[PDB]
């Protein structure tokens, strides 16, 4: 299974958005592509997929997150 | 190795009262004061002499710190036939009974021990051997048993105590004869485990010099035992 935890959440109504750091636990998997992360975040925060952006994803040494 | 039915050749060792049994392996042996029995289960060698059947006991260096010493080749051993010896730390007859063998009927062994339970067997062993006088008493206060002991030619201390130097000096001050024998067994771990062994031995030698014992010899006891040296000295009163 894959779990997505959002941390350091900030609400920026100046830019009309929410910023956060996404940590993705993906045991037994290489990594999660930005598409699946986008659809899961869209489901979690109940928004349209086009309204979700994700970037800057780095897997630590040793894998798993 | 040394099996039950094996035949061996017994020959004297350089030190009087110590004999060597030869063969494919060599065994350093002492004549049995009380023949026909083993005290801690040691192997016994019987020889027919015109014919009387004299017996001998094997003398395990891994059990008696003294024995590993002679295996290492101590130059001088004051323990000799017909001499008075004062054994400190006589936990049992494992080593005392053998020291009794060397001194022979003419000498005696003053065995000193503190803890009651090991002392009981020391009393039991003393029964078979007339020449031991076990003294169940704390060596730290030689005043208590000054009644039981006269002069002694050599003082042996196997006591494993951090203040072992003090005990030797007090005992030596009382009963050791002038120019007498001093043989000490030292374990640095018991004295000072913080510092290395060699530092400890130098410190112990120093305290002996403070107490008018002139050190004569010391030897490390490997491969039989770790961190152990036997210091041999002479008590120089004047």
């Amino acid at each position: 299974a894959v779990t997505i935890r959002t941390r350091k959440v900030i609400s920026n109504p100046l830019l009309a958005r929410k910023q956060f750091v996404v940590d993705v636990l993906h045991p037994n998997r290489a990594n999660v592509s930005k598409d699946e992360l986008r659809e899961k975040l869209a489901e979690v925060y109940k928004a349209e997929k086009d309204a979700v952006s994700v970037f800057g994803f780095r897997t630590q040494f040793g894998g798993g997150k | 190795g040394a099996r039950g039915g094996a035949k061996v050749v017994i020959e004297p060792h350089r030190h009087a009262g110590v004999y060597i049994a030869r063969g494919k392996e060599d065994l350093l042996v002492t004549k049995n004061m009380a023949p026909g029995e083993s005290v801690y289960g040691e192997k016994r060698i019987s020889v027919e002499e015109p014919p009387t059947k004299v017996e001998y006991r094997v003398w395990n260096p891994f059990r008696s710190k003294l024995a590993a010493g002679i295996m290492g080749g101590l130059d001088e051993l004051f323990i000799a036939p017909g001499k008075k010896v004062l054994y400190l730390g006589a936990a049992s007859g494992t080593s005392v009974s053998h020291v009794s063998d060397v001194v022979g009927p003419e000498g005696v062994v003053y065995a000193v021990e503190f803890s009651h339970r090991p002392g009981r067997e020391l009393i039991s062993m003393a029964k078979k051997r007339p020449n031991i006088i076990p003294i169940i008493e704390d060596a730290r206060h030689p005043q208590k048993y000054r009644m039981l002991i006269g002069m002694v030619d050599c003082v042996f201390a196997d006591v494993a105590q951090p203040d072992q130097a003090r005990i030797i000096a007090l005992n030596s001050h009382m009963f050791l004869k002038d120019q007498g024998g001093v043989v000490i067994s030292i374990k640095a771990n018991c004295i000072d485990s913080t510092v290395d062994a060699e530092t400890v031995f130098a410190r112990e030698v120093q305290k002996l010099r403070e107490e008018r014992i002139k050190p004569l010899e010391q030897l490390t006891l490997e491969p039989y035992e770790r961190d152990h040296c036997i210091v041999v000295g002479r008590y120089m009163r004047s």
Binding site: - | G72, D196, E198, T199, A202, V205, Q206, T220, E222
Partner: protein, 148 residues
């Protein structure tokens, strides 16, 4: 009976694995001048040299030499009696310090020898695993003590 002295258990070929901090160091009589003469304090020139706590040791023989020196070397005498300097008793008749020092290091491989005498230094050099301390230039120097 033949004697073959047993090489000390503190020695692996030429490295002494027993000498470790805090170090115990024997003080030679000549060391005191070249300490005083160079304005180098005894305790701490050692610490600066060895970067450790050092326990100086003055034997009776080296001590016995010092009072024999006389008034000219009173300063050396007083520094020898600094209470931080511990004293070692001796049980051999001779008062020759160089022989006494050589014997002690022969006996137990736990001392550093602090001296500048060429003859004594050579004798100690022959004995394996004896760190040899000396004072030269401005401060103390240690040759056979790789933990440095």
């Amino acid at each position: 009976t033949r004697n073959i002295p047993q090489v000390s258990s503190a020695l692996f070929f030429q490295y002494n694995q027993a000498i470790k901090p805090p170090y115990q160091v024997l003080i030679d009589t000549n060391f005191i001048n070249f300490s005083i003469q160079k304005k180098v304090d005894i305790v701490r020139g050692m610490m600066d040299c060895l970067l450790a706590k050092c326990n100086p040791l003055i034997t009776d023989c080296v001590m016995a030499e010092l009072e024999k020196l006389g008034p000219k070397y009173r300063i050396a005498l007083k520094l020898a009696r600094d209470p931080r300097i511990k004293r070692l008793s001796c049980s051999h008749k001779g008062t020759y310090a160089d022989d006494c020092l050589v014997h002690r290091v022969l006996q137990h491989k736990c001392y550093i020898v602090a001296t500048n005498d060429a003859g004594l230094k050579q004798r100690i050099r022959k004995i394996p695993g004896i760190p040899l301390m000396s004072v030269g230039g401005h401060a103390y120097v240690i040759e056979k003590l790789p933990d440095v």
